Structure formats: C-alpha cells, structure tokens
Design a protein around this ligand. Structure first.
Ligand SMILES: OC[C@H]1O[C@@](CO)(O[C@H]2O[C@H](CO)[C@@H](O)[C@H](O)[C@H]2O)[C@@H](O)[C@@H]1O
Ligand SMILES: OC[C@H]1O[C@@](CO)(O[C@H]2O[C@H](CO)[C@@H](O)[C@H](O)[C@H]2O)[C@@H](O)[C@@H]1O
Ligand SMILES: [Mg+2]
Length: 580
DNA sequence: CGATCACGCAC
DNA sequence: CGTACGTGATCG
C-alpha cells in the first residue's frame, strides 16, 4: 500500500518544475516563527521529500519558491507563507489552495486538514494530521520515514484533487471567488499577521496594577455584603450566596444550577447592594484575566508585538476569525475596557493608527438585496436608520422619537438582520412575545420589500438547499426541511442572515484587496494591521494621513456597486483608542 | 489533562 | 434573535 517517493539528500532540477503540489509542513498550531519540519514536492517528474535544512539553504530552491511563474498547489498556503516570512523567504506563485477551495465548497464540513478535504471526493489514501502527530501533551513529530510518507501523501492528494475541486467550484460559479478573492486575500492576511501590532506593555502593566487594586476593593466589599468569603468566580458558590443565604429571587435557571448571567443580575440589582458589586467585579475581572494578563502572555518579548492568526476557513458566513490573541473582540462599549486600546500603538516613531469603518453595511446590504423602496430611500438620504425605523414602526414624526423608542427600534433592526423571532426579540428587549410580535408586524408593514425577501429567501433555501452571497459564497441549510420547529426555525434565521452577514464579508474582503493594490500603486508605507468585520485598521507615517483620509474611504466605498451608497467613517490617532 | 460549562467580549 | 474566541471552574 506504501506510496513511492525519493527521500532526497539534495535539490535537483526536476524538483523545480513549473507546476507542483508543495507541502511546507509546520506542525505547531501557531505558526509564527515556528519550525518547518519537512518539505514534499509532487510534480510531473515524481514525488520528493526534502529536509528543510537542505531545501531552505539551497539558492535554486529558494528562488523557485519565490518565482511567481512557478505554480504551486498547496493546503493552507498562508501557514507556509508566514512560517517562511519569519525565515526571510518569499513564497510566490500559489495558484490553488485546497483549504480555501474546500471551505468555499462547504464551510460546514469543518475541513482543517488535507485528509478531510480529500474525503469530500472519496480520496482516502492520506492520514489525518491528528493520527500522525497526535494532539495535546502527546503531540510530536514522528521519525523521518513516517513523517516523509505523510507529507508525500498530502502532496499527492493535493496534486490529484486540484482539478475535481476546481471543476466543482466552476459549476457552483465560485471559481472567481477562490482565485480572485480568497487566494489573493490569503497573501494579504499573511502580511498583516507577520507585521503584527505593537503593544505598549508598560501601559498594560500599569493598567493591570490599578485593576488589581480595584478588584481587591470590590472583592472585599462583596465579602462584607455577603458576610462571608467565597469564590465569586464559581457560578455555584455564588449561586448559594445569592439565592440561598441572601434569598434573591430565581428569575432563570441553567441546566446545572442557578443562572448568574449579567442579564439576570441586572434584574436582581434592586434587591441587594451585593449584585452591583458582583457585576463590577466581573467587568474588572474580565479586563484583568483576558485583556491584560491574556494579552501580555502572547506579546513577543523582543519586539513587543502581538501576531494574531486570522482563520480564513472557519466561519459559516465567510467572516474571518482571529486567535492568539483575538484582536476582533477588544473592548470598546464601556469606557473602562475601552482604555485597553491605548496599549495598541504604531510600530514606528511618528506613525499613527488609522481606522475606517463601514456605516451600517449589513442594513445597506439588506436594502440592496431586498430592493425595499423605503429602506433604500432611507439610505439614499443617509438618514439615521434607527430613528427612521422608530418613526415608521411607532408612527411618529422625527421630533416625536424618544430615546427609548430609538433604542427599541435599534433592537428591531438587529433582530431583522439576525433572523427575526418574537421570542428572541422579546428576550432582548425584556418584553412579551406578543409585544415583540407586534413590533415585527409593524416593521414588515413599513418595509414590505424586506418582508418579501425574508419569505422568498427561506423558500429559496428550501428549493435549492443553500443560500448565497453577493460574490457567490454558499451555505447549505439541510435543517430547513426539519419537522422539528426549533431546528427548522434556526435554519430559517440562517437563511435570512447569511446573505446579509456573508455579503458584508465579501465586500470588505474585496475592499482589502483593492486597498492593498492602491497602496502599492501610490507607494505609500501605510499597511493593514487588522480587520474587524466591518472595519479596517492601518498604521502609517503621520505624513500619509491626509492621503489616507481620501484614499481608504473611497476604496472601501467603491469595492462593490449596490442600489444604495456605501458610507465609510474614519479616524486616526496616536493609539488605537485615539483613532476615534 | 483534556473536555465541557457558563459567562462576557466584539461586530 | 446572527457570527466568533478566551477565561476560570468544574467534570470525569
Ligand atoms: O493555519 C490556520 C488554519 O489551520 C487550521 C487547521 O487546518 O487551524 C489550525 O490553526 C489555528 C491557528 O493557530 C488553530 O486556531 C486551530 O486550532 C488549528 O487547528 C485551520 O482551521 C486554519 O484555517
Ligand atoms: O406562513 C408562512 C410563513 O411561515 C414561514 C416561517 O416563518 O415558513 C413556514 O411556512 C412555509 C410554507 O409557506 C414553509 O415552507 C416553511 O418551512 C415554514 O416554516 C415563513 O417563511 C413564512 O412566510
Ligand atoms: Mg461601524
């Protein structure tokens, strides 16, 4: 059953053909400055394994890697490209990435190794990575014969599966989505991750100290008000204090005990002074554990940068996610947590942080896809969309919209985008199902095009088996035909929400590609650092701000043409916090 | 010692 | 009511 290959001791010309499947193996999950443990090449001339110390010191091999006219097919080329950037080696000419291809064909399969992708086309002559390397404490690179066979089998699978994957993408009208959107984006994400974001660790450490002080003060107040010391971070020890010793009302349960989620606590606050303190303690503790201690844990001590990894092949809607650290969930709503962003600073002297965000991109996308006359007109007038929604559903003039009315209309707008449900809206606004249902009815009366869209997209999902986004991303929804109400209803909300969230993802991905091309044409030093779903964060010399103020919003606004304008706001400053 | 829960942070 | 990730506590 074994697969034949040459275990090479040196690089030869036949390993440098102008088309090959290439494996540059990095086993560490976080590939930043990580070891390359082996290399495999499969091409018209045969199958080869190379030790990295050999290949990466070979000028002909390094030149071949960097030659855009020598085409490579890979799985997770970003991992290889970043590991190689840390070694000062450029990887070019990647014309097919099997991870991205599998992800576009069906994000729900959770493909995260070559074996998983291969199994989609009944190809099973390759082992799962976890079977070869193990996981956790037991993880390890195996001896060379085992490692080499595995890497060659992966390269061989890629070599075989490129054509059938590309053919299916073409049938789905997704080939341009792979080749013109996701693959070029992967190179841009590699650059962003490698550049990293500079952290002011002294500032973080100062914050940590002050937080520790306040945590102590609140911890003691809590013990004083409880008349006893306990582990506040145990939802179970806390449940006893709250609902037994102090007799607070049980407004909600969890399947293992009493709920102490913030929504429940907020309702209990009027009964006892301890509750406000538990909330404050939780807020501070979140900042301390996750955003100070957690961040400091992953800052590289030499450069004081953090280098996130953007998972490009995970979310079911086409968004990116971010890990180690997650730079897509840094606090902003509450001023206390917002100050964390003061610690993210430009990487060079006299540079600044520039941040540009789409204004209401999801509702603008909804206006476009639903062709709702009222919603399109609202955005053509650049109205405050929550005030407008309040005017319509509560039937009042702009003057007559109160803050509470705008607040409830805002929640309705979220619900509509998420996949509206009377129960979920009711939970969010703390009102009755019947009341939430009345709001939803008034909304559909004011935006009948949106109502028609929500009905039609659920029927389309049922008919075709999937829904699609602007640039032809797809999500299969098998549960749409379930005879279980709750299962089916969740699938219906995904049918409604995915073309909205996913088309917004497509637009900002295209914007990133267009922006990098413009930055290069203009030879600006400015470069992307982060994407947070509907916003792009850059750093640049202070002397480039004026040019960026014009260039970045324009590129983002013009990335696609919709039936309504796109609008981008922007800010810049000496830290991420100040880019407001 | 990995897997799970409950919770809270972003958009 | 949609999409994510990290944490401390607990589970087994
Ligand atoms: O390299 C990213 C790419 O690798 C995958 C596995 O194929 O995820 C791995 O890499 C991560 C980043 O360090 C981890 O978060 C993840 O646990 C790990 O399996 C893909 O999911 C991802 O696109
Ligand atoms: O009465 C129609 C109304 O119900 C929805 C669910 O909110 O869909 C239901 O009715 C459809 C048939 O008309 C079914 O295909 C569907 O499976 C069922 O849940 C809405 O789509 C809708 O317009
Ligand atoms: Mg915004």
């Amino acid at each position: 059953a074994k697969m034949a290959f040459t275990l090479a001791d040196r690089v030869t010309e036949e390993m440098l053909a102008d088309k090959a499947a290439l494996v540059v193996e990095v086993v560490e999950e976080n590939y930043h400055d990580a070891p390359i443990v082996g290399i495999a090449v499969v091409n018209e001339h045969g199958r080869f394994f190379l030790r990295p110390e050999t290949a990466l010191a070979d000028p002909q091999f390094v030149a071949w890697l960097g030659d855009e006219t020598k085409k490579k097919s890979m799985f997770d080329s970003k991992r290889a490209a970043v590991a190689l950037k840390w070694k000062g080696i450029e990887l070019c000419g990647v014309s097919f990435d099997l991870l991205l291809a599998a992800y576009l064909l069906d994000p729900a399969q959770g493909v995260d190794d070559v074996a998983a992708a291969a199994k989609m086309k009944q190809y099973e002559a390759v082992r799962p990575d976890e079977a070869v390397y193990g996981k956790g404490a037991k993880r390890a690179v195996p001896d060379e014969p085992v490692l080499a066979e595995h890497l060659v089998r992966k390269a061989a699978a890629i070599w075989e599966l490129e054509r059938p994957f590309l053919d299916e993408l073409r049938r789905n009208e997704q080939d341009r989505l792979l080749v013109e959107l996701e693959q070029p984006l992967s190179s841009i994400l590699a650059e962003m991750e490698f550049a990293g974001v500079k952290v002011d660790t002294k500032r973080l450490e100062q914050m940590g100290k002050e937080l520790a002080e306040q945590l102590g003060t609140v911890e003691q107040r809590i013990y004083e008000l409880a008349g006893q010391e306990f582990n506040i971070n145990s939802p179970k020890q806390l449940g006893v204090i709250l609902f037994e010793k102090l007799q607070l009302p049980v407004l909600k349960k969890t399947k293992t005990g009493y709920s102490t989620s913030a929504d429940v606590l907020e309702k209990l606050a009027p009964y006892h002074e301890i509750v406000e303190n538990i909330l404050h303690y939780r807020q501070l503790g979140k900042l301390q554990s996750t955003y100070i201690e957690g961040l400091l844990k992953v800052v590289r001590p030499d450069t004081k940068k953090v280098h996130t990894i953007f998972n490009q092949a995970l979310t079911q809607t086409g968004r990116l996610s971010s890990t180690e650290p997650n730079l897509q969930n840094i606090p902003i709503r509450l001023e206390e947590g917002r100050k964390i962003r003061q610690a993210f600073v430009p990487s060079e002297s006299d540079w600044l942080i520039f941040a540009a965000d789409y204004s209401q991109i999801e509702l603008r996308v909804l206006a476009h896809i639903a062709e709702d006359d009222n919603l399109m007109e609202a955005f053509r007038r650049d109205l405050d969309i929550h005030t407008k929604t309040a005017m319509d559903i509560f039937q009042v003039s702009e003057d007559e919209v109160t803050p509470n009315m705008r607040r409830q209309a805002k929640a309705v707008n979220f619900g509509i985008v998420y996949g509206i449900s009377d129960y979920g809206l009711a939970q969010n606004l703390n009102i009755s199902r019947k009341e939430a249902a009345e709001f939803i009815e008034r909304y559909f009366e004011s935006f009948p095009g949106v109502k028609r869209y929500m009905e039609n997209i659920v029927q389309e999902a049922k008919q075709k088996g999937y829904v699609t986004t602007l640039l032809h991303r797809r999500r299969y929804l098998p549960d749409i035909t379930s005879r279980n109400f709750n299962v089916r209803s969740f699938a219906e909300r995904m049918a409604m929400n995915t073309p909205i969230q996913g088309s917004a993802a497509d637009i900002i991905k295209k914007a990133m590609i267009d922006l990098n091309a413009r930055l290069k044409e203009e030879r600006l030093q400015a470069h992307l650092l982060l994407q947070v779903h509907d916003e792009l964060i850059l750093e640049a010399p202070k002397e480039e701000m004026e040019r960026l103020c014009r260039l970045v919003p324009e590129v983002m606004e013009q990335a696609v043409t919709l039936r309504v304008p796109l609008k981008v706001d922007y800010h810049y400053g000496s830290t991420w916090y100040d880019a407001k």
